[PDB]
Each structure stands twice: as structure tokens, then as C-alpha cells.
């Protein structure tokens with residue numbers, strides 16, 4: 228897997244962001260995580276966390292996994308990094324997303340994220356409180 232540069236256009240919610248990738252605006256959906264919808268508990272906090280992380284970053288990178296690269300809605304499926312820190316991981320570690328979906332061959336970081344989720348759950352953080 229390799230990191231590719233991208234530019235933030237707009238943070239949408241906890242697990243969806245809009246980036247300039249290959250000269251076009253593209254929606255990206257974070258691999259292996261599920262934040263609550265903004266209309267649900269911790270949804271607004273999950274939105275806020277992702278927004279700050281990506282808006283404050285000097286460098287955004289996208290890393291596609293080895294499986295399918297877009298969902299049925301045209302959204303890129305990637306791990307996103309802000310100054311080398313994975314947003315997917317940071318959200319799970321903060322108890323603001325659950326580990327989820329896990330399919331179409333995109334599981335490279337599954338263990339890393341499950342380890343993060345267990346620690347958030349052990350700390351009874353946010354979603355787990």
C-alpha cells in the first residue's frame with residue numbers, strides 16, 4: 228500500500244470527506260470505520276473531530292487498500308492521513324467510530340483498528356461510555 232498526496236476541499240461528517248484527488252473533487256469514505264450520522268449520539272462529536280484533524284493538517288494523504296477502491300456511490304475507499312496520523316485509527320481510538328464493514332478485500336489495517344477499538348472500549352470512551 229502507498230500513500231498518495233491529496234488536498235482537503237471539505238470535511239463532510241465523521242467518516243466522509245471531500246478531497247482534490249487526481250485534479251478532481253472526489254468524496255472519500257474512510258475504510259473500516261463507521262461514525263454515527265450527525266443526527267445520532269456522538270455524530271456531531273465524530274464530525275467535529277474529523278473536521279479539526281483534516282482542516283488543521285499541513286499534509287493530507289490517501290492510501291487505497293488492496294481491494295475495491297470505490298463504493299457503489301462513487302466514494303473513494305481509503306485510509307486517510309493527516310500529517311502521518313491515520314484519521315480512521317484516531318477516530319476509533321477516540322471512541323468516536325466503530326470498526327465496520329470489513330470486506331471486498333480491504334482489511335490491511337483491520338487489526339490495528341480493532342486494537343484501537345478495544346482500548347477505547349476498555350476506557351469506556353464516548354460511544355462506549
Ligand SMILES: Cc1cn([C@H]2C[C@H](OP(=O)(O)O)[C@@H](COP(=O)(O)O)O2)c(=O)[nH]c1=O
Nearest residue numbers: 243256257258259260261298299304328329
Ligand atoms: C466503508 C464502506 C462503506 N460501503 C457502503 C456500504 C453501505 O452501503 P448501503 O448504504 O448501500 O448499505 C454504506 C455505508 O456507508 P455510510 O456509513 O457512509 O452510509 O456504504 C462500502 O460498500 N464499502 C466500504 O468499505
Ligand SMILES: [Ca+2]
Nearest residue numbers: 242261262263
Ligand atoms: Ca457513517
